[PDB]
Structure formats: C-alpha cells, structure tokens
Amino acid sequence: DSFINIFVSIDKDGTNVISYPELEQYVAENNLDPSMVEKWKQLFDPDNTGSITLETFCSKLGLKPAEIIDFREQKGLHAA
Ligand SMILES: [Ca+2]
C-alpha cells in the first residue's frame, strides 16, 4: 500500500496526528520490525515534538494534506 493509505491506516481516530501508541500498534499488528517505530519518529518527527502530524508527514514525502483527506473520504465511503 501507498504512504497515503498507511497514514490513514495508522491514524485510526482520524485526528491527522499519528500518536506514538497508534504507530506502535500498527507495527505490532502487522508483524513489522520494532525499529520501524524509531525510523518513523526520525523521518516524520525530526524535532521530537512527541507525535507525527499529517503536515510533517506530507512535507517529508512530497504529498499534500488534501491527498490523505481524499483517501480518507473515499475509504470511508467505500467501507460503507
Ligand atoms: Ca491519531
């Protein structure tokens, strides 16, 4: 899946802030390497703010927030 998709999957409450527990739950539930947590923090929370915003995620990856929002609206609709 795309980074757009994975962001929406991790951010299960839709706040457009990935909390560290959200990230950690995704890693464990998908049997990923726990080092993944540190990599996301380093790439997407470089200033160590304590969470990962949609804004910083998008700036690092060259995405716009509008792309995650579209996907979120489509996922919701599709799911229904
Ligand atoms: Ca969240």
Numbering used by the authors: 2 to 81
Reproduce, without paraphrasing, sentences from the article in which this PDB structure was first reported.
The initial phase determination and model building were carried out by the SAD method with an anomalous signal of one selenomethionine. The structure of the calmodulin like domain is composed of five α-helices. Ca2+-binding motif 1 (CB1, residues 12–23) is a Ca2+-binding loop that contains 12 partially conserved residues starting with N-terminal aspartate and ending with C-terminal glutamate as in the EF-hand motif of other calmodulin like proteins. One Ca2+ ion binds to CB1 via D12, D14, T16, V18, E23, and a water molecule (positions X, Y, Z, −Y, −Z, and −X, respectively) in a geometrical pattern of a pentagonal bipyramid. Moreover, CB2 structure appears to be similar to that of CB1, but a Ca2+ ion is absent in our structure. A significant difference is that the –Z position of CB1. The molecule shows structural similarities with the calmodulin like domain of a family of soluble Ca2+ sensor Kv-channel-interacting proteins (KChIPs) and of the short Ca2+-binding mitochondrial carrier (SCaMC) with r.m.s. deviation 1.8 Å and 2.8 Å, when 60 Cα and 62 Cα atoms are aligned, and DALI server Z-scores 8.2 and 8.146, respectively.
Tegumental protein of 20.8 kDa from Clonorchis sinensis elicits IgA immune responses in the host and does not cause an IgG response. For this reason, we named the 20.8-kDa tegumental protein from Clonorchis sinensis as CsTAL3. The interesting thing is that similar results were reported for SmTAL2 and FhCaBP2, 40. Both proteins belong to the TAL protein family of the class of fluke proteins that consist of a calmodulin like domain (or N-terminal domain) and a DLC-like domain (or C-terminal domain) as in CsTAL3.
